[PDB]
Amino acid sequence: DISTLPRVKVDLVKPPFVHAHDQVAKTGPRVVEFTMTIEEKKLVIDREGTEIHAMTFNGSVPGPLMVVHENDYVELRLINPDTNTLLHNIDFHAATGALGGGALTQVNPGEETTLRFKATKPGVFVYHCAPEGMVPWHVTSGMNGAIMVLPRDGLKDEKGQPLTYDKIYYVGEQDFYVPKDEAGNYKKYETPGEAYEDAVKAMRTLTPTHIVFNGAVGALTGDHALTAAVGERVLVVHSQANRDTRPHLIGGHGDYVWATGKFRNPPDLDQETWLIPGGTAGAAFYTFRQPGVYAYVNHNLIEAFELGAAGHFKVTGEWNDDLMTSVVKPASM
Amino acid sequence: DISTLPRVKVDLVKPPFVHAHDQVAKTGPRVVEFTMTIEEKKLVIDREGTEIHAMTFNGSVPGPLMVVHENDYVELRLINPDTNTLLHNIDFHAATGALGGGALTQVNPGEETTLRFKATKPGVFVYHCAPEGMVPWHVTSGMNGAIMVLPRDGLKDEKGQPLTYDKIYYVGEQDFYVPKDEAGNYKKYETPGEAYEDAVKAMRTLTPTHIVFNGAVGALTGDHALTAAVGERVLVVHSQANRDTRPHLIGGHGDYVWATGKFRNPPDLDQETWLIPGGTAGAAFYTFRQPGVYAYVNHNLIEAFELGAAGHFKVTGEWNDDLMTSVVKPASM
Amino acid sequence: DISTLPRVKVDLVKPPFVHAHDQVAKTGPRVVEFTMTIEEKKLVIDREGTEIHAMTFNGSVPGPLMVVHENDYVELRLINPDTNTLLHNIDFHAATGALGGGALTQVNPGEETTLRFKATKPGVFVYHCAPEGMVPWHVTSGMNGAIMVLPRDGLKDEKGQPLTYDKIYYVGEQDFYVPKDEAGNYKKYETPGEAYEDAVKAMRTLTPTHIVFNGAVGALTGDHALTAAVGERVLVVHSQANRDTRPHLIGGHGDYVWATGKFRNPPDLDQETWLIPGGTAGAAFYTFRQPGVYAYVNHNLIEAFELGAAGHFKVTGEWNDDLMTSVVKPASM
Ligand SMILES: [Cu+2]
Ligand SMILES: [Cu+2]
Ligand SMILES: [Cu+2]
Ligand SMILES: [Cu+2]
Ligand SMILES: [Cu+2]
Ligand SMILES: [Cu+2]
């Protein structure tokens, strides 16, 4: 009987950060309460000033990472304010039935709804908008995020021993398909109803114009670079709701990787690069051993360095010359 | 000595259905006899009435699913009637030698051939046409299917315990590359010899115009939706002879998945989405827990909802509010 | 203390061959010394005579395969002769820190450098050039290879028993993006500075014009076909530094496959086709059971047979009719 269970309210944070949680469950099963507010907003996605009409959960691309434990109940209040123009809903890949919740959460502007589901399977999972007839347009306008369902006793390695992370980050990777005119410049749009047929044509090329982490080219760089220290254990959750990606930490590895994100399976070890299929979230665990700047990329390097799918880690600490050293620095012959 | 073995004749059925077989072998090894007749035919593949000249095994796209057990012999009589115009053959990925049988099965119109091979490796495998110089054109015109080689003691989970399916379906996913004129309309063709250079150009874009399940947009919907009941265990075999796909059951999971389809490996558990590489068959096992409509899609959602790679399950039975419920139905604020 | 360790000089060989090494380590840890010389050179990549300005390690596409054991040190002397025009460097995915060595190995024409790193993780790994701002252009001009870090006790199967190969080959698969004019003919270029913006535009299509093994259409055919004998155990290392591929041995299998190439993980068994993600090296082990010609392809068959990603094995020995036979040869009805 669910009314006898503790309720706990979570206050979400903006990606790439993740709200407070406990790896090993300190309580029995709970109803974990979340609220998200849908926001249709203009977003500038590149250095050139290209502006799209984004569709977001909670104002960000990606949507925030939700964290629960196996056999908790997730209760989501989903709000669509009357300042929006479109119908929206939510499909959780973590959930069982009704199109992942999609059939039960259709909200017009000015409406809200509350969905509850039991988190029966441990893993990282995609969530996304999926309104009938408009699914890829909403997803590829930014309306997707992820949920992590931890095992009650936390993460384990391939031998069943504990793995504990010191820091966690959520990297949402987004493919955008900005319509172009015949000369190749991006088109602008007044009403999404007028945008719609050009959006479809752009999608049908299967060729994204931009592929970004955290909603924009360069979003996870400079002052917004991810951070760690030598010796810290970092979990990076990565999602792609529509298109395959292949993350790689330049100068590191995925020590333990769940490429398709499901924690009942043993992790793959020592990965250089891993494939996260479109419609999937994955997770990689790494212990940093060297200080300095690392690039975290989709290792289609064109997608990374030309289309935007690259971020940075800045790592503090002590350089290890046993692991790597310049024996003779670059010099003339 | 093969002449001492029982022979059994199989009568094939049209996908997505699968011919009668036993999961656990009730006999010793057998010679299992199949017949297929090649048919070049016009097929309408979308709602707009786009018509292609398809190349088929047994009149369908995909070709039928053949089912044997490990260490059975497969004996295939392949017939190319003189009403066809092209040379064809067959490559079984399940087989060892002679280009999977391709080098031994070249049949002109008016010819037949009989190939035998031993099914030494358990799994689901692609078969396809592969005539020298014309391989991708035949494959991408529909001339591919799959074969399932069951272990003699049936399927097992990750702990070596039995997994028994109540129903099985075969979903063949087909990428088509229909030639387009400069304005973007599909071109029509008299003789495949006149079609050939435009077919090559269309393929070289690497951008399919249609991606369909069971030979057409909407083929696995309405009266032709897949069915199950709450509590039933369903195996879905999925093949893609040319191009990667990423199946997802919207509102469900892959409880046990062999993404690359080979049953000596343990299955991956609790998958949301899995990657089947082009040139591969995979298999996913799910026990339905909720009634209603489910969408089964390639989770590149553009490929699903715009290009055609989506089908439906209709599931009867009892709704489970513990797993999912609407707490507050969509309403104004 | 590294100065107390044995040093061993390796003399590299051109792909697809691999330099001499021992599967099981016959010594303790060593400093293994390699030299590579960068060469910018014109390469003809197809039957039509299309010529590109390639960028190579040691004169070949791919670069040579380097082979060490776990916990050896790799010491690479990298030479950029003053006959080249561009700045280059090297990122080893096998290495830990400084962008895989990229930050410590920037060499102008007329310079050299010597990098040392400890090979802490066993597997096959990509190496590639990665100069700041120019990464995909260098990689997709051919400047990539692979390194194999064997476990000290050699390869093991899924049960921990030894796997010993009799022959090893290295297949580097390269996506090229040759710029085209509006009519579709390939453009030619004087200075790479003048080529640069057209190279970027060609890459941004995400549609390679050529995909080749060992640097050219048909490179691994005829007199340069790979060879084996019935009963021989062959390891094929395959890399793709930028783009996903899906190798398949037509008429065979991958008996043991490390699709993402990391030997601490058990191999996948009996694969028909496997996915190597872009930015990854993989390895497949097969024992040949039948003589004749086999095609080794990327099983996107358009990529194979139209764009160039196909090679041949020629296998000598004894035909096994139990495994496969023509019962009735192709004939009229
Ligand atoms: Cu929406
Ligand atoms: Cu989905
Ligand atoms: Cu054919
Ligand atoms: Cu094939
Ligand atoms: Cu370079
Ligand atoms: Cu790299």
Side-chain angles (χ1 to χ4, degrees), chain B residues 73 91 93 97 106 110-114 116-118 121 124 126 204 241-242 244 260 262 264-265 278-279 281, chain C residues 246 248 250-251 253 255 269-273 299-302 306 322-325 327-328 330-333:
Chain B
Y73 297 83
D91 172 343
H93 290 186
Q106 290 164 69
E111 301 183 330
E112 66 173 83
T113 188
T114 295
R116 183 168 62 233
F117 73 88
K118 197 183 193 166
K121 292 173 183 296
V124 289
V126 167
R204 286 171 78 94
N242 191 64
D244 305 334
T260 60
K262 311 297 169 285
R264 289 195 186 123
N265 304 294
Chain C
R246 60 215 53 78
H248 181 96
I250 298 174
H253 294 89
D255 288 337
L269 305 177
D270 298 333
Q271 300 293 277
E272 65 188 307
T273 302
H299 213 292
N300 181 313
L301 301 167
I302 302 160
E306 307 304 322
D322 184 56
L323 286 177
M324 184 178 285
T325 203
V327 183
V328 181
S332 298
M333 310 180 270

Side-chain angles (χ1 to χ4, degrees), chain A residues 44-63:
Chain A
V44 176
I45 61 173
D46 68 16
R47 309 302 194 187
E48 289 83 7
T50 308
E51 198 171 44
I52 67 165
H53 286 281
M55 301 176 201
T56 77
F57 292 108
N58 249 27
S60 58
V61 177

